[PDB]
C-alpha cells in the first residue's frame, strides 16, 4: 500500500543499491560479463551498460528513477551511462547510515550534498588540463579514443575527418554584448544532421556547408553552377488559377473550348512570369509544378526543384536567406540566395539529389555518407556518432580530465580537505560524497583483478601527498601516471557525471513516503 | 536430505570466518551494549532487576545488571569478564569498558565490510591503544596530593557519586568524605605502609525518613539490642570491653559430660554447682574492671543475672566480621574460652548507647574526640525501598574510588564530562593520518569509537546529539594563541536539560576523571574488543 | 538487495553454475568422440527415433534446459557452419577449460587472470599450428591420399564396415566434380538421394542422374546403348479437337474412325519425334534414343515408341529436366513444333532398375555431366539417417582438403604436441605475468581432453597411452629428428599418423581452438546471473 518515513528511505536506497550492483562490472576496458536470463528460453551476454539496465525489469519506483538518470545522461553526453548509476548508488549508500544511525533529517542531508557538488565541480576543473581544440592532429588523437577496439578502427582517419569538420562548422562560436553569448553551444543532433546516400565507400564521404535535399527536379539537364545565385521559396503550386467564388461557364460552340484551353495556359504562365520577373536561378516549390510551368520556368534560365516540404524550405532559407512566400504572385525581388557554390542535381546511387553547398556557415551543416550498401552506410553512421559525441564534448570545453579513477580520487581527497573545515551537522553527509566518489577507482581495481583495499589505499596516498594524475592501469592493475598512460576524458562528461549523480540521489533521499492511488 | 558442508564436529552448526562468525558475535554483544549505553552519565537510566529468588530492585549500575544477568553467549562473557577487571584493583570504569568495547566492535564491522581482515584491524587497534595510553599522560591538569583533607577528598568523591545518584550528590559527598576523613590518617608523603581498606567504612540504612537526617558515626553500629539490664554506659572515658566467642553460660565438656539426677539432693547439689561455676566465670570478668561484655553467641539466664548485678552491659554480636571490626574500635580480642578475659585482651570504648534511626533502635560503639576508631559508619535513611538500596551502593562506590588514589600517580586528574574523550578523537586521528598503509583505517575508526561518551552524555540529558556533538567538536577545533591548547581543554557536555545550546567548562564544577581509571579502561576495553575479533569460530565439546 | 520478480546470483555461484552445467554438456558429448564413441537415440515424441553420432544434429535436436549449456551448444553450432566439423572437439575443449579454470579460481585466481592466459596460449597455439601443418601437393591425382581423408571423416561416424563401402564413394564423387584446373570446388555438384529396400552396404556411386518415373510399356528397352536424349516439356497424352466439336455419324464404325481422326492431333507430334531419330542415327548400330518428357505420354504414344525400340519416359521432375540439359548437352523444347536434329543430347547406357515397389532410371556415361549422384541405401530410417550424415560430411571433408592444401596429422598428435609446446614455451618465456602463467598452464592441460577422451572411449587407460606418446615424442626431439607421434586407438600404443593415414582438417582445428577459447572465456568472465520478468 504505502511505505512511510524510514520505510521510504530504506526502500529507495535499497533499490538504488541493487541497480548499482547490476552494472559494477561494466566499468573499464576489462568489464566483466553478466548473464541476462529472459522469461523465454534465451539468454543474453551483452555487457553494454545501457542494454543491461534496459533489458532487466525493475520493481521499485526508485530503481526506475535510477534508469531515468542513465537515460538523461545518454541524451546529455555520449558517455557516463554507468558512472552516474554507480556513483549515485554509492552516494545513497553512504547517506544511508546518516539517515538511520545518526538520525540526520533529510533536509540536512540534501543541503550538504548540494555543497559537496559545488566543491566537487571545482576540483574536476582544477585537475584538468587544456588541449588546443584548433589543432586538428591533436583532435584526431582524442576522437580515436572512441573509435579503437572496434572493427571500424581502420576507418578512424575518415571518421575523425567527418566528425571534426562537421562539429566545428555548427559550433556557435560567438560572443558580444548585443546578440548574446552562445558560449560555444553545440547541438549535433539538429545541426550536424547526417544523410546516407548509396554508392561509393567510406572514403568518399564529405561534410557539406548547406542543405542536402533528397527531392528530384523538373528536368535532369539544368545548370549546376551559378555565378549570381538567386533562390525562390514558394508553397503554392503552379497550376490553373481558379476563383474563390462561384463561376458558371456554358459552352455551346465547340470552337470556344480552345479559348478555355488558351486561358488555362495563360494562368499558369502568369504565375511563372511573377517568378521569372525577379530573375531567379533556382525555384523551390513545396507543391507540384505543372508540365507547362516546368517549361515556362526552365526556358527563363533557372532551375526548378519540386516537392520540398516547409521543413526543408526552412533549412534552405537559413543557408540561402530566401524568404518563404505562400502565394506565387506575391514573390518579392528581395528573395536571394547568392554566394552559393552549386545547385548540383547529380544522380547518386540511381537516386536524384539537390545540393545547395555554399561558402557560408549559418550555424549548421550536413554530413553526406557514402557506402556500397545500406549495411555499410549504417555501419559508418552508427560508429560515426561516437566520434561526433566526443568531438562535441571536447570542442564544448578545451579541458580534459584524467581517467583511470584519477579525477574521482582527486575529488575524494580534496573534499576531505574541505570537510575538515566544514562546521556543523552537515559535516557528516558532506563526507558521504567524498567517500562515494571512490567507487570508480575501487571498481576499476576489482575488474582489473587487484586488491580493492591495498591498491586503493596506495592510490589515495599518492593523491594525498603527490599529484592528481595518478590512476589505475586498466590492463596491468598497477598504479600508473595518467600522462604516461593517456586515458583522458573530456571535462564535460566528468562535470555532468557528478552533477546528475548527486542530484538524482537528492531526488530519492528527499522522498519520505510512497503512496498508491490513481 | 539437504546436504551441509563444513559441519563435522558432533553435528554442531558452527559458523566459519567466511560465514560472518565475527559479525554475528558482535551482533550478540550489541544487545548488551545498548543495555549499558543508557547507564552512563549523571542522567543515566534506571533498570528493574527481578532476582529469581523473588526480589525486585532498581539500579543505575551496569555491573550489577551484568552480575544479575545469566550471560550465556561467550561473545558477551568476554566483555563481562572485562567488567570484573574494572572491579578488581579499580573502583570505577565499568561503563567505560562496556561502552567503549562495544563501539570498538561496531566500527570494526564497518571495516570488515570493506574487506579489511580481523588481523589487520586488531593490529591497528593495538597501535592506537599504545598511542592513546601515551597521549593521556599529557592531558593532566591537576593532581591529588594525598594530604587526606576533607576538601581534597570532596573534589574526587563528588564526580564519583554522580551518575549513580543525581540530585543528592552534595549530601552523599559529605557523608562519604566525612567518613573517609575519619579513617584516613594525618600524614604526607608516606607510601611505604598500605592503609584505608574499603572495609574500613560501613554503610547502614533504615527504612523511613530521608537523607536530610543522615550522619556519620565514629565507630560501629550493630543491629542487636542490649540483651542485659544495662542499656548504656556512663559518660566516663575508657570503659573496659570484654569480647567472647564462647556463649556466656556454663562451660561444656569435650567428651560426654552429661549430668544424671536420681536423688533430690543431687538436683540441689548440681544446681548449686553450675550456679557457682557461672558466677565464678562472671565474677572473674567483673573483677578485671570490665563494664561492657560482647558475646559472639547467646547468653544464659544465670549469666544475665550475674552480669546485671555487676553492672556490665551485655551486647550480642553474632557476626564474625563485626567482631573482627570491633577489634578496630575497642581493640578487644575475642576470647576463645569463657571467664578469663585477660586485661591485655580488653578494649576501650568511650561511649556505648542506643540510638533511634528511622524509628529502629540500634546499639552504637563509638568514641568522640579520643581513642579514635579506625572504622567509620555512614547512616542512611529513606522511605522508598528501591531508591534507598541504590543510594547505599553509591556510598560504596565513593569509598572504592578513594582507594583508587594509590601511590603510582593515581592522583592525576584529567578533564571529564567527555572533554578527555573529545581531545583523544583529534589526537588519535592525527596518529592515523601520519601512519602509512592500511593501519590508518583501524586507527581512525579507533578514534571514532570515542565519540560515544559525549554522545551518551548528551542523549541521557535529553539533548539533541546532532547539535551537541558538532558544538563539542567545534569547541575543541579552535584557534589558540600557540601550538598548545589552553582554554579549550575544558569544554565538556553540559548536563543541564536546558533548551537552546552550548557546552560547559570543567572548571565550573571541578569535573575531573582519574588517569588510572582512564588508562586502565583503555587497556581493558581494547583487549576485550580485540579478543572478540580474534574469534572466528566457536566450538563446544566435552572437556 | 532484491527486487520482486528478479534474482541476482552472487558469491561466485554464477561461476559454479557455469562450470557445473558445462561439465554436464561435456559428459554427454564426451561419450561420443572418435570411431570408438557411442550412438545416441533421439526420440521426437511422435514415435520417430533418429540414430546419429553427428554433434551438430545432437546439439541441434537435443533438448537443453541449462542456460549455460544452451550457450555452449549454440556457439558450437555457429562453428559447425564456419568449419564443417569439430563440434564435439569444441564442446570438450570448453568443458575442460572451465573445469581446469574452476580449480584455480577456487584458489584465489581472478577469472580475468585465467582468461588473459587463455588468450595468450591461444595465440601461441596458432603459431604452433603454422609450424605443425604439412603442405599437401596441389595435384588432383592424390586419390591415394584423399582415400585416407575420406576414411578419417567417415570412420568416425560409421560402423567401420560401411567405411569400406563409402570411402571410394566420397573420394571419387568429389574428385569427379572437381575440375583438375585451378578453378573451384563445389560439393553441391554431388546429389544425395535415398532409397529403401536395400542394405546400407549397397550404397553406390552413379556417374549421372537418377529419375524416379520409369517407362510404362513392357516392350520399351530397359537398356539403351549410346542414347540420344530428347528434352521435351509438352504432353504427348491423347489430344482432343482444338475447339468444341462432336462426333456426328450415321454408322457405328464411323464413331471410332472419327475418334481416330481426332487422335491425329497428337500422332503428328509422335511422327515428328520418330522422324527425329530417323534423321539422327536412325538405323546406325550402337545408337539409341531416350525421351525424358516432363509431361505425360499416352500409352498409345508409348506403343509408337516401343515399336521403334525407343525408351520414352514421362512426367519427369523439373529439377532433373534442367540438370539433364546440362548433363546431356541437349536443349529443352517447349513444343514438338520446334523439334530439330540439333536438339538431341547424347549419353551412354540408360538403365531402368525395377524393385518391388519402385522403378529408377539411370542416365550414366555422359561426355561432361558436371554432376554426380550418390544413392544411400537402407531398410529403415536408422541406416538412412546415419549414412546420409556420413556421406554429406565425408564429401565436405575431402572437399576442404582438396581446396585447402593444409593438412594436419591426427591421432591426437596435434593436441598432445600443443600440450608439450605450451608447457615448455611458457616456462621458457614466462613473459606473461607471475599470475597469468597459471591460465596458460590451465589451457595447455585442457587441450589434453581430446587425446584422453579418444583413448578412454577405446577402453584403453589414458594414463598409459598418453605417457607412451609423450615418451616417443620426447625421444624424437632428443634425437634431433622431426616425427609425428599420435595414439593408436586399436593397439593402445603410439603410432605415426602420417603413415597410418589419420588426418585432420587444418581449418577445423584452427577455428576449433579459437572458438573453444572464446566460449570458455565468455563464461569465465560471467560474474553474476541476472534474472527478471520470469
mmCIF file of N, CA and C in Angstrom, chain C residues 335-387:
data_model
loop_
_atom_site.group_PDB
_atom_site.id
_atom_site.type_symbol
_atom_site.label_atom_id
_atom_site.label_comp_id
_atom_site.label_asym_id
_atom_site.label_seq_id
_atom_site.Cartn_x
_atom_site.Cartn_y
_atom_site.Cartn_z
ATOM 1 N N UNK C 335 7.819 -27.236 -77.292
ATOM 2 C CA UNK C 335 6.851 -27.835 -78.197
ATOM 3 C C UNK C 335 7.565 -28.654 -79.262
ATOM 4 N N UNK C 336 6.927 -29.752 -79.672
ATOM 5 C CA UNK C 336 7.445 -30.550 -80.776
ATOM 6 C C UNK C 336 7.500 -29.726 -82.060
ATOM 7 N N UNK C 337 6.733 -28.635 -82.127
ATOM 8 C CA UNK C 337 6.690 -27.822 -83.340
ATOM 9 C C UNK C 337 8.065 -27.255 -83.681
ATOM 10 N N UNK C 338 8.924 -27.101 -82.671
ATOM 11 C CA UNK C 338 10.276 -26.605 -82.890
ATOM 12 C C UNK C 338 11.308 -27.719 -83.017
ATOM 13 N N UNK C 339 10.879 -28.982 -83.031
ATOM 14 C CA UNK C 339 11.798 -30.113 -82.998
ATOM 15 C C UNK C 339 12.747 -30.097 -84.188
ATOM 16 N N UNK C 340 14.030 -30.330 -83.932
ATOM 17 C CA UNK C 340 15.066 -30.315 -84.951
ATOM 18 C C UNK C 340 16.192 -31.258 -84.556
ATOM 19 N N UNK C 341 16.983 -31.730 -85.527
ATOM 20 C CA UNK C 341 18.047 -32.691 -85.197
ATOM 21 C C UNK C 341 19.120 -32.127 -84.280
ATOM 22 N N UNK C 342 19.230 -30.802 -84.162
ATOM 23 C CA UNK C 342 20.311 -30.221 -83.371
ATOM 24 C C UNK C 342 19.956 -30.171 -81.890
ATOM 25 N N UNK C 343 18.766 -30.651 -81.523
ATOM 26 C CA UNK C 343 18.309 -30.556 -80.143
ATOM 27 C C UNK C 343 18.860 -31.696 -79.298
ATOM 28 N N UNK C 344 19.041 -32.875 -79.890
ATOM 29 C CA UNK C 344 19.301 -34.085 -79.122
ATOM 30 C C UNK C 344 20.627 -33.989 -78.374
ATOM 31 N N UNK C 345 20.616 -34.452 -77.124
ATOM 32 C CA UNK C 345 21.831 -34.742 -76.398
ATOM 33 C C UNK C 345 22.320 -36.160 -76.657
ATOM 34 N N UNK C 346 23.360 -36.535 -75.916
ATOM 35 C CA UNK C 346 23.980 -37.842 -76.083
ATOM 36 C C UNK C 346 24.496 -38.343 -74.744
ATOM 37 N N UNK C 347 24.293 -39.635 -74.492
ATOM 38 C CA UNK C 347 24.823 -40.297 -73.312
ATOM 39 C C UNK C 347 25.033 -41.770 -73.628
ATOM 40 N N UNK C 348 25.705 -42.461 -72.713
ATOM 41 C CA UNK C 348 25.899 -43.893 -72.831
ATOM 42 C C UNK C 348 24.698 -44.692 -72.376
ATOM 43 N N UNK C 349 24.930 -45.674 -71.505
ATOM 44 C CA UNK C 349 23.871 -46.581 -71.091
ATOM 45 C C UNK C 349 22.809 -45.840 -70.291
ATOM 46 N N UNK C 350 21.554 -46.005 -70.695
ATOM 47 C CA UNK C 350 20.399 -45.596 -69.902
ATOM 48 C C UNK C 350 19.741 -46.871 -69.399
ATOM 49 N N UNK C 351 19.616 -46.996 -68.081
ATOM 50 C CA UNK C 351 19.221 -48.246 -67.455
ATOM 51 C C UNK C 351 17.999 -48.018 -66.578
ATOM 52 N N UNK C 352 17.036 -48.925 -66.695
ATOM 53 C CA UNK C 352 15.858 -48.946 -65.830
ATOM 54 C C UNK C 352 16.021 -50.066 -64.811
ATOM 55 N N UNK C 353 16.099 -49.694 -63.537
ATOM 56 C CA UNK C 353 16.118 -50.682 -62.468
ATOM 57 C C UNK C 353 14.716 -50.799 -61.884
ATOM 58 N N UNK C 354 14.252 -52.033 -61.705
ATOM 59 C CA UNK C 354 12.955 -52.305 -61.104
ATOM 60 C C UNK C 354 13.131 -53.054 -59.792
ATOM 61 N N UNK C 355 12.496 -52.550 -58.737
ATOM 62 C CA UNK C 355 12.450 -53.234 -57.456
ATOM 63 C C UNK C 355 10.985 -53.440 -57.085
ATOM 64 N N UNK C 356 10.762 -53.987 -55.894
ATOM 65 C CA UNK C 356 9.422 -54.377 -55.504
ATOM 66 C C UNK C 356 8.383 -53.291 -55.704
ATOM 67 N N UNK C 357 8.671 -52.085 -55.223
ATOM 68 C CA UNK C 357 7.684 -51.012 -55.187
ATOM 69 C C UNK C 357 7.949 -49.921 -56.223
ATOM 70 N N UNK C 358 9.204 -49.744 -56.629
ATOM 71 C CA UNK C 358 9.597 -48.570 -57.399
ATOM 72 C C UNK C 358 10.464 -48.945 -58.595
ATOM 73 N N UNK C 359 10.520 -48.042 -59.570
ATOM 74 C CA UNK C 359 11.494 -48.076 -60.649
ATOM 75 C C UNK C 359 12.416 -46.869 -60.542
ATOM 76 N N UNK C 360 13.631 -47.017 -61.070
ATOM 77 C CA UNK C 360 14.600 -45.925 -61.129
ATOM 78 C C UNK C 360 15.299 -45.956 -62.484
ATOM 79 N N UNK C 361 15.438 -44.790 -63.109
ATOM 80 C CA UNK C 361 16.127 -44.657 -64.385
ATOM 81 C C UNK C 361 17.493 -44.020 -64.151
ATOM 82 N N UNK C 362 18.530 -44.610 -64.743
ATOM 83 C CA UNK C 362 19.895 -44.108 -64.625
ATOM 84 C C UNK C 362 20.367 -43.542 -65.956
ATOM 85 N N UNK C 363 20.892 -42.320 -65.912
ATOM 86 C CA UNK C 363 21.413 -41.630 -67.083
ATOM 87 C C UNK C 363 22.939 -41.476 -66.997
ATOM 88 N N UNK C 364 23.672 -42.588 -67.026
ATOM 89 C CA UNK C 364 25.110 -42.566 -66.803
ATOM 90 C C UNK C 364 25.876 -42.401 -68.118
ATOM 91 N N UNK C 365 27.200 -42.284 -67.978
ATOM 92 C CA UNK C 365 28.149 -42.308 -69.091
ATOM 93 C C UNK C 365 27.901 -41.126 -70.038
ATOM 94 N N UNK C 366 27.956 -39.934 -69.453
ATOM 95 C CA UNK C 366 27.841 -38.693 -70.202
ATOM 96 C C UNK C 366 29.225 -38.143 -70.520
ATOM 97 N N UNK C 367 29.294 -37.362 -71.600
ATOM 98 C CA UNK C 367 30.569 -36.790 -72.023
ATOM 99 C C UNK C 367 31.125 -35.844 -70.965
ATOM 100 N N UNK C 368 30.282 -34.959 -70.433
ATOM 101 C CA UNK C 368 30.686 -33.983 -69.420
ATOM 102 C C UNK C 368 29.488 -33.677 -68.527
ATOM 103 N N UNK C 369 29.143 -34.587 -67.605
ATOM 104 C CA UNK C 369 27.891 -34.434 -66.851
ATOM 105 C C UNK C 369 27.896 -33.240 -65.907
ATOM 106 N N UNK C 370 29.088 -32.816 -65.488
ATOM 107 C CA UNK C 370 29.285 -31.793 -64.459
ATOM 108 C C UNK C 370 28.412 -32.023 -63.228
ATOM 109 N N UNK C 371 28.161 -33.281 -62.872
ATOM 110 C CA UNK C 371 27.274 -33.601 -61.757
ATOM 111 C C UNK C 371 27.416 -35.082 -61.453
ATOM 112 N N UNK C 372 27.357 -35.448 -60.177
ATOM 113 C CA UNK C 372 27.305 -36.847 -59.784
ATOM 114 C C UNK C 372 26.160 -37.078 -58.804
ATOM 115 N N UNK C 373 25.818 -38.351 -58.624
ATOM 116 C CA UNK C 373 24.761 -38.751 -57.708
ATOM 117 C C UNK C 373 25.278 -39.874 -56.822
ATOM 118 N N UNK C 374 24.968 -39.807 -55.533
ATOM 119 C CA UNK C 374 25.221 -40.901 -54.606
ATOM 120 C C UNK C 374 23.867 -41.393 -54.110
ATOM 121 N N UNK C 375 23.654 -42.705 -54.174
ATOM 122 C CA UNK C 375 22.404 -43.314 -53.733
ATOM 123 C C UNK C 375 22.647 -43.993 -52.391
ATOM 124 N N UNK C 376 22.018 -43.473 -51.343
ATOM 125 C CA UNK C 376 22.175 -44.009 -49.995
ATOM 126 C C UNK C 376 21.088 -45.047 -49.758
ATOM 127 N N UNK C 377 21.500 -46.269 -49.443
ATOM 128 C CA UNK C 377 20.586 -47.384 -49.263
ATOM 129 C C UNK C 377 20.324 -47.618 -47.779
ATOM 130 N N UNK C 378 19.149 -48.167 -47.488
ATOM 131 C CA UNK C 378 18.866 -48.679 -46.163
ATOM 132 C C UNK C 378 17.479 -49.272 -46.041
ATOM 133 N N UNK C 379 17.243 -50.045 -44.980
ATOM 134 C CA UNK C 379 15.935 -50.665 -44.794
ATOM 135 C C UNK C 379 15.021 -49.775 -43.961
ATOM 136 N N UNK C 380 15.599 -49.008 -43.041
ATOM 137 C CA UNK C 380 14.854 -48.134 -42.150
ATOM 138 C C UNK C 380 15.531 -46.770 -42.070
ATOM 139 N N UNK C 381 14.877 -45.851 -41.359
ATOM 140 C CA UNK C 381 15.428 -44.512 -41.195
ATOM 141 C C UNK C 381 16.658 -44.500 -40.295
ATOM 142 N N UNK C 382 16.957 -45.617 -39.630
ATOM 143 C CA UNK C 382 18.185 -45.703 -38.845
ATOM 144 C C UNK C 382 19.416 -45.668 -39.740
ATOM 145 N N UNK C 383 19.539 -46.642 -40.645
ATOM 146 C CA UNK C 383 20.681 -46.664 -41.555
ATOM 147 C C UNK C 383 20.673 -45.459 -42.486
ATOM 148 N N UNK C 384 19.488 -45.046 -42.944
ATOM 149 C CA UNK C 384 19.414 -43.950 -43.906
ATOM 150 C C UNK C 384 19.888 -42.643 -43.287
ATOM 151 N N UNK C 385 19.496 -42.377 -42.040
ATOM 152 C CA UNK C 385 19.914 -41.146 -41.378
ATOM 153 C C UNK C 385 21.416 -41.143 -41.121
ATOM 154 N N UNK C 386 21.936 -42.227 -40.540
ATOM 155 C CA UNK C 386 23.360 -42.281 -40.224
ATOM 156 C C UNK C 386 24.212 -42.207 -41.486
ATOM 157 N N UNK C 387 23.845 -42.964 -42.521
ATOM 158 C CA UNK C 387 24.646 -42.979 -43.742
ATOM 159 C C UNK C 387 24.613 -41.625 -44.439
#
